[PDB]
Amino acid sequence: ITGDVSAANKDAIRKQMDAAASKGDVETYRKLKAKLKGIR
After which residues are there C–N gaps above 2.5 Å in the chain? none
**H helices present in 1-40, as ranges:** 6-21, 26-36
Torsion of CA 31, 33, 39, 40, to 10 degrees: -90
Residue 17's CB: how many other CB atoms inside 10 A?
A: 18
State which approach was used to obtain the coordinates: NMR
Which CATH number fits the domain that encloses residue 13?
A: 4.10.810.10
Dist. CA 23–CA 1, nearest whole Å: 32
Sign (positive/negative) of CA torsion 11, 12, 16, 17?
negative
Whether the Cβ atoms of residue 26 and residue 7 lie closer than 8 Å to each other: no
Contact 18, 26 (CB under 8 A): no
Number of domains in the chain: 1
6 is in which domain, residue-wise? 1-40
- Provide the 8-state DSSP code for 23: T
Does residue 36 contact residue 14 with C-beta atoms inside 8 Å? Answer: yes
